[model samples]
Target chain A: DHRLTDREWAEEWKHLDHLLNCIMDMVEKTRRSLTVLRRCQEADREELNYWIRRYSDAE
Target chain B: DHRLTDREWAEEWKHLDHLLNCIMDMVEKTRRSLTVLRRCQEADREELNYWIRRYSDAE
Candidate 1:
């Protein structure tokens, strides 16, 4: 379908951390529809950092 | 770091669906950590083992 699958935009994200941010974007949207999430997830912080380091060194 | 990166696991996933599934995984773990305060539970598990396989291949 021509509808937004999120896949189309996802294809544009070359950097990995952005995807994590995008994941957050998804979560935030869904939280409104269904919803603690009052605090940020540690995994997200660490995950972003890991991506920063890994890709920074590689390319 | 001797840990797995969902980003690293994300590296080897070629198909858009698996890629989408992998994103759900990042979302899943974050949500699991945050839900103590989410959808796509089924896809996350299926994606997990594949990431494990990918991690070995990646390493």
Candidate 2:
């Protein structure tokens, strides 16, 4: 862990980049689930809408 | 925009840290959403569980 190899730096950066993409996947899937759940009258409509909008890729 | 000061280095590192933390929040809230959606039969149960477990902090 002592620092400064170009290879190690690239590896760490790539790992961080992958995590960000994982987060995007999670958000997208979550939004999809929220959308599907909206049809359930027993489910909380406002809450579902809130999360769907929260993860939306659109402006 | 080019190269280092102790202050600038710290600022950039802090910014990266903030984004990672933002990703954690996104993952967490996404998990919350998946959990809520599990109650809906019309929704895909496996998909919900996949995400729920995918982001599980547990091994």
Candidate 3:
């Protein structure tokens, strides 16, 4: 859910690439969770883009 | 699905977006072949085949 967290911080603080990277670690963890789900379910492969989009959403 | 509709599409375009989203998900799900067979059982093969050709080619 916090996949876009770093993006928010980066946008808010123009020079905060460090903070953005830190938040992106958390997003990568989120991406890993997605990877696990993708591996566990065949249906997930088809649906991966949808979940990725949800994570990547501007909201 | 109307949520994605632009301010000016009018309600009629809702059907287009709705069906498009449905078809998009179907094509995206590679495992969907069997599921589609199950769901569209009573459906016509030629009709389904026609749509299969038409929709996924959108991208």
Q: Which stretches of candidate 3 lie over 4 Å from their true place?
A: A1-15, A43-59, B1-59
Answer with 1 or 2, whichever has the higher lDDT: 2
Runs of candidate 2 with Cα error greater than 4 angstroms are: A42-59, B22-59
- What interface RMSD, in Å and to 1 decimal, does model 1 have? 6.0
Q: Which candidate is the best by TM-score?
A: 2
Q: What TM-score does each of the candidates earn?
A: 0.23, 0.50, 0.23
Q: What does candidate 3's lDDT look like per residue over A1-59, in tens digits? A: 65668777777677566665876786588568657654545453335445444444523
Tens digits of per-residue lDDT for model 1, A1-59: 66656776676565566877886887788786443222233434454456545554554
* Leading candidate by lDDT: 2
Q: How big is the positional error of residue B49 in model 2, measured in Å on the Cα after superposition? A: 26
- By summed lDDT, the worst window of 10 consecutive residues in model 3 chain B runs over B38-47
**Which segments of candidate 1 are over 4 A away from where they belong?**
A1-26, A30-59, B1-13, B38-59
Best of the candidates, DockQ: 2
Task: Estimate the TM-score for candidate 1.
Answer: 0.23
- Ordered from best to worst TM-score, the candidate numbers read 2, 1, 3
Model 2: colliding residue pairs: none
